[PDB]
DNA sequence: AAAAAAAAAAAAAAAAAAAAAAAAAAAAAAAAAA
DNA sequence: TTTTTTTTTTTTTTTTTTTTTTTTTTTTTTTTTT
C-alpha cells in the first residue's frame, strides 16, 4: 500500500530481505515508482528489475518521478556490486535519454549518474566513452538557449558538460590520498598515458566523422569547437586545455601533405583554426608582466598554482575538477626548491584569479602551439583558392582586434600592401576589414584609394565608408582633401544607392556641420574656415573635380525638386553664410590659397543663384579699384553678379563705369573678356548710357586710319575693338559687320604677320560670340586659307579660339538641360570640328611640345564632346602613343582609354592604321633615334589585353599586322616593340617564331639568289628570333635590350 | 519550235567557342518578436 | 536581451542561349542536245 511504503520510508529514514523482496515483487506487477524508490534507498535482481521499471517508465514518458533517478547516482557511487551486465543498460538509457525545465534536471540526473558511473568502475572507460561518441548526431544545429546547460552567463551543451567532466573524473590524486616515490610516478603515468589515447581518441573520431560529411555534419564539431572556446576561460575546467591542445594539432594536420581534402573542408578547418588561435592569442595577451614558461620565475608560480587551487576549491570546488587540477600539478613538480615544494605538496596530501589563471597554461602546449598558427595563416595567404584567402586574412582581422600592435611586424604589411592592389571583391573587402578595424589605417590611404573604381558594388561601398571615416577622423588638410575629392569623385556611378550615400555624407560634411552650431558664436570661425579651405582646394587638382563640384553644387544644392522646402531653406541660409563667411576672409586677406578663396568665390558668384549682395559688391570694390590675377577673378565675380542683382545705386555704377574706362588701355587681354561684358551689364542698368557709345567711338575713329593705311598700341586699339564687337551693342550697319570688315581688310597677305595673327584671332573669336558671321563666305575661306597655307603659329591661335568656344557652347548648352523631371501632363560648333578634324588631326603630330599639346587638348575635348566620327581620329590618337614624351603618351592613354570603354568596336576596327601610322611618325621623327623608343606597342597591348577575347583579338591584329609589312626602319622599329610584348600563352610565341623563322629562311634564299637593306633585315629578324628564344600535339599542349642589339649591327 | 547536265544561290544540320543566366552555398548585417 | 526572418554581397556549380564556321541538301536558271 502507498501508505505502507510511505511509513517505511520515513522509518529508515529516521533509523538513518523480505522488504525487498516484496518490492521486486511489487516493481514486477505510481506504486510501482514509489516501492523502486523505497527499495533503491534502503539498498541482482533487486536491481535488475528497477532498471527495468526505470526502462519502461522512460520509454512511456518518450516530482514523485523524480526521487529514484535522484537516489539511484548515490547508491551507484557508494555500492560497487553491481556486475557488468547491468550496467551496459543504464548506461545505455542514459545515454540515449542525455541526448533527446523538468527536462533540463532529468538531463542533469542523467549525466550526474553517467560521471558516477565512470568514476566507480575503473575497467567500463572506453564503453562508456564509445556509448556518448555514438550519439553524437543529437547534437544542436543552432545554440538556441532552450535546450542547454549552464557553468556566469555562460551556456554549455549537455554532451560536452557531461563529457568534461568524465575526461576529468580520472582523479589520481585520490589515490594519493591511499598511499620513496615509485608507484604513485608509475600510477601517474598509466593514467596520463591512458587519458591521453582516449583524448586522441575522441578527437579521432570527431575529425573522421565531420569528414565524412562536412556540408551537413559540421555542427557536430562546429558546436564542440566553439564551445571548447568559451570553457577555456575558466580555471574549474582544466582538461579543456587538453581537449583542444589535441584538437588543434589535428587541425594543423589538415593543411599538411598526403591529407588532401576538398575545399569546403579546407574552408572550415581554416575558420575553426583561425577562431582558436584568435582565443589562444586572447588569453596570452591578457597575463602578468612575465609569463616565460618556455621549458626554460620557477620559484613564484607553485604560489600562483597553489592560490588558484586554494580558490577553486574555496568557492565553487566541484571536487573533480580540483582533483584533476591536483593531477595535472605532477607534470609540473616532477632543483632543490621544486623538490621540497613536492615533498611538502605530498605531506600535506598524506578578476584576479583570471589573469593569475593564465599564467599557468604557458607551460601547457595549447599557448605554445600559437606560432604554427600564424606560420599556417601566412602559408595559406599566399594559395591561389580564393576562399581560403579571404577566410585566412578575415582570421588576420579577428586576431588583430584583440591586439592592435601586430602590424609591426613586416611580413602583413607586405601581405596587405600586395592584397591591395590585386585581388578579388571578397579578398579586397576582407583586407579592408582588416586595415579599417585596425586602430591606425593612414599609412595605406593611398592604396585603399586606389580601389576606389572597382567593379563591384560592396569594394566601392567600403571604400567609401572608409573615407568618411578618414575624413572625419584626421585633420591633416592634404589627406583631407584626397578622401573629399575620393567622394566628390564617387557621386557620378551605376549604383544609385552609392550616389545617394555620397551626396548625402557630402551635405552632411559641407551643409548640414555648418548648421548644427546655428549661428552658435566661438564655433563658426572654425569649422566653416575649414569647409572653405576644403571646397577651394577641390576646385584644382585634377579639375574634373572641380566639374564635379560644380555639378554637386549647382544641380544638387540648389534643386528644389530634389528635397523638400524644409530641407532647401536651410542649405540655402548655410550657403549665405559661408559666402558671407568666404567675402569677409577675401577682404581681410587682402600665394596659391589666396587663388583658391578667389576660384571658390567665382564659382558660387556663376551658380544659378546669387548668394552675394550690394555689400559683397562695396567690399570688393576698394581693391577692384586699386591696382596680378586679383583683377581676373574679381572681374569674373562682378560679371556673375550684375547678372542676377539689380537696384544699384546711380553714383556706384557711373564710378564703377569710370574706374572701368579708365583702366581698359592698361588692362591686358587676359581680362579685357570680362571686363567687357560687366561694362555692358552695368550700363544697361543705367539707361542713357551714351558714354560708353563715346568710349566705343573713340576706339573707333583711333583704329581708322590704320585700316586705310592698310588698303604697340595697335595690339591693344585691336583687342578693345573686338571685344567692344562682341560684348557690347548687339542691335547703316551693325558694329560687328564693321569690325568683320575691318579685320577682314587687316588680314591681307601683305599684312605683316603679328599683326595678321592677331587679326585671325580676334576675327575668330569674333565668329565664335556671333555664329551667324561663320555663314559669310570671307571668314571661311580666310580660314581654310590659314589652316593650308602652312603657317606655324596662325593655326594655333585659331585652334585655341575654337577650344574656348566649344567649351562656352557645351557648359551652356549642359546649363540648358540637367537635372529636372518632365511631366507629361504639365550645330555650329559640330560642323567647325568636322570641317577642320583634318587640320586638327595633322597638327597632332608636330614635334613641337607647345602646339602638340594645344591640339592634343582640342582633339581630346571634341571626342569627349563626340561631334565627330572618332574613326578618323582613332589612328592618331594612336600616333601619339609613338611620341617620346611622356606627358604627351599618358595624355594620349588616357584619351585612348576613354574612346576604348565608349567604341571598342571601332578601336579595334582601326587599330591596323593606328599602327601603321604610329610607324610612320615614329621613322619620321627620329630619323637615327628611332629604334630608341618602342613603348607604344606595349601599351595599346595592356590597354586591349585585359578582356578574356581582348587577347586572342589584340593577338590576331597582331598578326595581320606582320603580314601586312611582310619599310626598312618600319620593320626595324616594329620588331623591337614585338621584342617587349609579353605573351599570354606559349602556342602564340610559337606560332611568332615559326612566321619569323620562316621569314628569315625566304629572305636568305633571296640574298643567296642575288642589297643592304635586304640582308640588315634578314639580321634583324634573325637577332629577333635570337632574343626570343634567349628571353624565355606540341600546338595543343601549347595553348594552356633589343635597341642595343639593333644598333651593334653597324 | 522540243529535251538532259552543270554554273551555281539559298536553306537547313553539325562541330565547336564563347557570352551571359539560374541556382545552391556562405558570410554579414539589419528589422521584428519572444 | 536574446532569438527569428529579411536584405545584401560574392563564390561555386550547371544551364542557357548567341555566335562562327563547316558541311550537305535543295532548288533555280543557264548551258548543252534535237
Known amino acids: 500500500t502507498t501508505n505502507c511504503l510511505t511509513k517505511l520510508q520515513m522509518t529508515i529514514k529516521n533509523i538513518t530481505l523480505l522488504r525487498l523482496l516484496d518490492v521486486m515483487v511489487c516493481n514486477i506487477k505510481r506504486y510501482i515508482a514509489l516501492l523502486s524508490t523505497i527499495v533503491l534507498f534502503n539498498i541482482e535482481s533487486y536491481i535488475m528489475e528497477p532498471v527495468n521499471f526505470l526502462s519502461d517508465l522512460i520509454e512511456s514518458l518518450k516530482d514523485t518521478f523524480q526521487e529514484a533517478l535522484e537516489l539511484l547516482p548515490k547508491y551507484i557511487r557508494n555500492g560497487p556490486f553491481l556486475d557488468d551486465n547491468v550496467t551496459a543498460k543504464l548506461v545505455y538509457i542514459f545515454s540515449d535519454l542525455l541526448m533527446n525545465s523538468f527536462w533540463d534536471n532529468v538531463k542533469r540526473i542523467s549525466s550526474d549518474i553517467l ?61 594519493c590520498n591511499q598511499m620513496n616515490i615509485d608507484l604513485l610516478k608509475n600510477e601517474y603515468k598509466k593514467q596520463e598515458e591512458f587519458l591521453f589515447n582516449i583524448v586522441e581518441h575522441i578527437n579521432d573520431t570527431i575529425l573522421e566523422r565531420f569528414f565524412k560529411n562536412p556540408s551537413a555534419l559540421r555542427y557536430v564539431i562546429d558546436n564542440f569547437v566553439q564551445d571548447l572556446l568559451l570553457l577555456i576561460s575558466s580555471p574549474q575546467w582544466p582538461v579543456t586545455e587538453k581537449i583542444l591542445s589535441s584538437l588543434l594539432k589535428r587541425l594543423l594536420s589538415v593543411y599538411s601533405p598526403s591529407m588532401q581534402v576538398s575545399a569546403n573542408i579546407e574552408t572550415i578547418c581554416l575558420q575553426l583554426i583561425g577562431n582558436i588561435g584568435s582565443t589562444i592569442f586572447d588569453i596570452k595577451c591578457s597575463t602578468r608582466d612575465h609569463e616565460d614558461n618556455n621549458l626554460i620565475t620557477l620559484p613564484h608560480f607553485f604560489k600562483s598554482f597553489e592560490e588558484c587551487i586554494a580558490y577553486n576549491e574555496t568557492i565553487k570546488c566541484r571536487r573533480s575538477a580540483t582533483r584533476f587540477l591536483w593531477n595535472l600539478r605532477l607534470g609540473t613538480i616532477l632543483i632543490i626548491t621544486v623538490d621540497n615544494e613536492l615533498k611538502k605538496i605530498l605531506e600535506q596530501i598524506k578578476s584576479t584569479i583570471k589573469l593569475d589563471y593564465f599564467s599557468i597554461l604557458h607551460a601547457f602546449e595549447l599557448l605554445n602551439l600559437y606560432d604554427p598558427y600564424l606560420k599556417l595563416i601566412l602559408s595559406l595567404l599566399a594559395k591561389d583558392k580564393i576562399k581560403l584567402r579571404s577566410t585566412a586574412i578575415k582570421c588576420l582581422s579577428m586576431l588583430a582586434s584583440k591586439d592592435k600592435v601586430i602590424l609591426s611586424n613586416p611580413m602583413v604589411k607586405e601581405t596587405i600592401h600586395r592584397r591591395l592592389n590585386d585581388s578579388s571583391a571578397s579578398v579586397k573587402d576582407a583586407i579592408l576589414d582588416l586595415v579599417s578595424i585596425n586602430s591606425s589605417y593612414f599609412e595605406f590611404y593611398q592604396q585603399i584609394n586606389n580601389n576606389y573604381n572597382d567593379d563591384s558594388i560592396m569594394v566601392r561601398k567600403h571604400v567609401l565608408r572608409i573615407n568618411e571615416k578618414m575624413y572625419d577622423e584626421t585633420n591633416d588638410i592634404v589627406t583631407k582633401v584626397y578622401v573629399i575629392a575620393r567622394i566628390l569623385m564617387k557621386i557620378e556611378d551605376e549604383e544609385d544607392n552609392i550616389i545617394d550615400m555620397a551626396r548625402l555624407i557630402l551635405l552632411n560634411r559641407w551643409i548640414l556641420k555648418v548648421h548644427e552650431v546655428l549661428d552658435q558664436p566661438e564655433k563658426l570661425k572654425e569649422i566653416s574656415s575649414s569647409v572653405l579651405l576644403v571646397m577651394s582646394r577641390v576646385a584644382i587638382m585634377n579639375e574634373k573635380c572641380s566639374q564635379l563640384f560644380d555639378l554637386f553644387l549647382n544641380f544638387y544644392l540648389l534643386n528644389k525638386e530634389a528635397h523638400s522646402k524644409e530641407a532647401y531653406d536651410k542649405i540655402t541660409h548655410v550657403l549665405t553664410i559661408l559666402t558671407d563667411f568666404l567675402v569677409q576672409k577675401i577682404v581681410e586677406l587682402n600665394i596659391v590659397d589666396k587663388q583658391n578663396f578667389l576660384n571658390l568665390l567665382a564659382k558660387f558668384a556663376d551658380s544659378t543663384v546669387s548668394f552675394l549682395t550690394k555689400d559683397h559688391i562695396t567690399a570688393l570694390y576698394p581693391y577692384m579699384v586699386s591696382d596680378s590675377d586679383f583683377h581676373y577673378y574679381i572681374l569674373q565675380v562682378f560679371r556673375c553678379t550684375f547678372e542676377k542683382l539689380a537696384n544699384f545705386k546711380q553714383k556706384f555704377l557711373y564710378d564703377l563705369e569710370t574706374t572701368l574706362l579708365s583702366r581698359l588701355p592698361k588692362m591686358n587681354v587676359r581680362e579685357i573678356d570680362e571686363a567687357m561684358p560687366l561694362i555692358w551689364s552695368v550700363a544697361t542698368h543705367r539707361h542713357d548710357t551714351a558714354r560708353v557709345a563715346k568710349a566705343c567711338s573713340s576706339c573707333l575713329s583711333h583704329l581708322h586710319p590704320y585700316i586705310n593705311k592698310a588698303n604697340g598700341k595697335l595690339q591693344r586699339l585691336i583687342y578693345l575693338s573686338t571685344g567692344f564687337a562682341r560684348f557690347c551693342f548687339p542691335k547703316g550697319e551693325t558694329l560687328y559687320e564693321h569690325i568683320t570688315k575691318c579685320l577682314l581688310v587687316l588680314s591681307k597677305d601683305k599684312i605683316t604677320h603679328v599683326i595678321r595673327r592677331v587679326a585671325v584671332k580676334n576675327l575668330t573669336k569674333l565668329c565664335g560670340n556671333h555664329p551667324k558671321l561663320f555663314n559669310s563666305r570671307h571668314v571661311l575661306h580666310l580660314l581654310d586659307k590659314e589652316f593650308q597655307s602652312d603657317q606655324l603659329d596662325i593655326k594655333l591661335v585659331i585652334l585655341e579660339s575654337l ?72 589612328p592618331t590618337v594612336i600616333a601619339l602613343f609613338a611620341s617620346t614624351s611622356q606627358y604627351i603618351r599618358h595624355v594620349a592613354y588616357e584619351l585612348l582609354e576613354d574612346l576604348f570603354e565608349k567604341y571598342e568596336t571601332l578601336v579595334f576596327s582601326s587599330l591596323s592604321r593606328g599602327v601603321t601610322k604610329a610607324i610612320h611618325y615614329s621613322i619620321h621623327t627620329d630619323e637615327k633615334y628611332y629604334y630608341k623608343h618602342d613603348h607604344f606597342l606595349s601599351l595599346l597591348e595592356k590597354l586591349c589585353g585585359t578582356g578574356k577575347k581582348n587577347g586572342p583579338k589584340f593577338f590576331k591584329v597582331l598578326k595581320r599586322i606582320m603580314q601586312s609589312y611582310l619599310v626598312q626602319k618600319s620593320i626595324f622599329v616594329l620588331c623591337t616593340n614585338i621584342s617587349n610584348i609579353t605573351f599570354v600563352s606559349q602556342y602564340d610565341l610559337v606560332s611568332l617564331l615559326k612566321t619569323i623563322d620562316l621569314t628569315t629562311d625566304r629572305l636568305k634564299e633571296v640574298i643567296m639568289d642575288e642589297l643592304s637593306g635586304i640582308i640588315l633585315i634578314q639580321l634583324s629578324l634573325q637577332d629577333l628570333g635570337t632574343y626570343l628564344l634567349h628571353l624565355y600535339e606540341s600546338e595543343l599542349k601549347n595553348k594552356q635590350f633589343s635597341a642595343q642589339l639593333e644598333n651593334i649591327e653597324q
Do not use: W
Not at 518632365?822 to 570641317?835: K, P, Q
Open 115 to 175: 560521471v558516477s558511473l565512470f568514476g566507480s568502475f575503473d575497467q567500463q572507460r572506453g564503453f562508456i566513452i564509445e556509448e556518448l561518441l555514438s550519439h553524437i548526431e543529437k547534437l544542436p544545429t543552432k545554440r538556441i538557449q532552450k535546450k542547454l546547460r549552464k557553468v556566469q552567463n555562460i551556456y554549455i551543451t549537455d554532451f560536452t558538460f557531461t563529457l568534461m567532466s568524465m575526461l576529468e573524473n580520472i582523479n589520481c590524486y585520490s589515490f
Open 803 to 874: 577650344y574656348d568656344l566649344f567649351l562656352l557652347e557645351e557648359r551652356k548648352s549642359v546649363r540648358n538641360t540637367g537635372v529636372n523631371s518632365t511631366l507629361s501632363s504639365n550645330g555650329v560648333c559640330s560642323a567647325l570640328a568636322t570641317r577642320f578634324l583634318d587640320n586638327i588631326l595633322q597638327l597632332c603630330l608636330l614635334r613641337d611640345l607647345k602646339n602638340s599639346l594645344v591640339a592634343i587638348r582640342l582633339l581630346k575635348l571634341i571626342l569627349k564632346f563626340g561631334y565627330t566620327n572618332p574613326s578618323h581620329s582613332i
